[PDB]
């Protein structure tokens, strides 16, 4: 499995695309990156601990 059980910079959006939009954010739990506008976050709202759907759902 691609994880190697390690935390890496991994673009995993609900979009199931590794594509980069104008804006992306990183999950504090598993390090994965997402388009914030898909996750309900913007560069204005970036929290200290954003949890991703793969972690929080």
């Amino acid at each position: 499995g691609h994880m190697d059980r390690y935390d890496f910079e991994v673009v995993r959006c609900i979009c199931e695309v590794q594509e980069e939009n104008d804006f992306m954010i990183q999950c504090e739990e598993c390090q994965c990156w997402q388009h914030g506008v898909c996750m309900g976050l913007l560069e204005e709202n970036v929290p200290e601990k954003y949890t991703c759907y793969v972690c929080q759902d």
Binding site: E20, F23, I25, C27
Partner: peptide, 11 residues
């Protein structure tokens, strides 16, 4: 939560 932005190529 780490963050990044882009718009065009690096030229």
């Amino acid at each position: 939560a780490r963050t990044k932005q882009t718009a065009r190529k690096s030229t």
